[PDB]
């Protein structure tokens, strides 16, 4: 009574989920190997330059500091939200050992990312309460997290029905495509912009590591949605496609509101309009990766260096 | 409305579990840092010698091969059982960010350990089905896993009552103290015995890495049980202490049955009696770490080199 590859599935599989071999989803196994080879620790990056620039007076404009605090405050608790969604929602529904294997890698990388913001907070001497509670004090940040949390909560408060599998797909889109593949990429562009100006390079280097992990996290999650679409064609209905297109649209309006609140006035080489262009370009890119009609007109990448 | 350390607790905490700082359980944070610094991959260990010894005729006695297959077959799927218990049971009930931080590390290390047995199975050319389905075909292995699984299932099929928190404590004992801290240690002694005879050294070296992770996994889980005992003194009743002492007793009888079936005749420098002595010594050691009356008389360590 050993497991055959035909018995294994992304969701609602009857095969023994405790048996890794034989592998069916090689693409999932490949991501796990790539994630492991990207081992890094935030304490490996020196913060001396960033600490000096932070404590100094002329080091950063008041707009740059606020942009930095809002970005850090958003990322500090967002990584925990993604990690909790993996554990409490994604892991249960993916009935596949090799995919769960990568989820364990991804979850741990979220702990490294969370570690990165404890290290930044402790290094720069930031207020822990102000930074980690920022996602309940700032409306622009709170609206983004509350919006993504609903798709996590909806799974927990509903047995393999089409509505159930569609609700799980909404969760994968909200966290892999939107949270990690859109909101984080926009926040990455803001911080890396300072790094390109040789400002807060220690924070920027850690963001480069997080972005490398984030690229695999997104790549895996798109593959999951696409792999689930292959095995469950009945789930990718025209109504659900418009649901996902609508989710991307709201998520962009939440980030526009966030970008405006984070950068009232644009800083050197960065503003809310350019971030609106990048978010609009990335969103269209996510639509193409999901086989979705783009929600915006053709938009160039304002940051081709990302 | 920021989080104070007084609001944070091991279980049933009301503090925002999404906010890592301020840290209350430094011991949990310390384990996470130690786990990360133990980064290793099973593919870093060469198997050429082990592959040659395996394919050769005189390389291993028939008793050694069976002992090796049963040990591998047990560990190949046991790591998934521990990982699933972390995600589906332990993570939900531990209402604490720094402890969840380590759980994400531990869960990933379980994926590395599971990776180790895919690598061993693929290297030695073992039957994947025979190895990964062995825990449903061998009664001695099946009885052990089925016994531990009940404590995972009982949590999933019952809201913060004393019975609920005691059932979660039974789960921590079953998987941290018994599964990882007893059954794995006994299985470690069997394989490392071959390594000390310069037999299957590649497998033995990987087991040394797993044992290093396993020591932290056990250390963390004992700390969790002890930390929960501090904050919930009403849970550590005399009846529950005897429940745990009874769990350890059954778990030892399941391993005695496993040891006998795995080693009918003892091999060079190893037999079921010595493994019974080690299990009995380790079990008494676990009792002392939990503030429990030992279940066996004073027993020396047959393997002081472990
Ligand atoms: Fe991520
Ligand atoms: Fe373990
Ligand atoms: Mn992340
Ligand atoms: Mn393990």
Author numbering:
A (entry chain A), B (entry chain A): 23 to 180, 184 to 331
Quote the study on this structure.
Data were collected using U-turn raster-scanning applied to silicon nitride membranes. The sample preparation and deposition onto the membranes were the same as for galectin crystals. The exposure time per crystal was 0.05 s. A total of 68 061 images were collected. The hit rate was 58.1%, from which 22 224 images were indexed in the space group P41212.
Within this work, the possibilities to perform SSX at BioMAX, the first macromolecular crystallography beamline at  MAX IV Laboratory in Lund, Sweden, are described, together with case studies from the SSX user program: an implementation of a high-viscosity extrusion injector to perform room temperature serial crystallography at BioMAX using two solid supports – silicon nitride membranes (Silson, UK) and XtalTool (Jena Bioscience, Germany). Here we have presented an initial integration of two SSX environments at BioMAX in order to collect diffraction data from micrometre-sized crystals of membrane and globular proteins at room temperature. The environments were different fixed-target scanning supports and an HVE-injector for LCP extrusion experiments. Data collection using fixed-target supports was comparatively fast, simple and required only a few microlitres of protein crystal solution, which could be grown directly on the support.
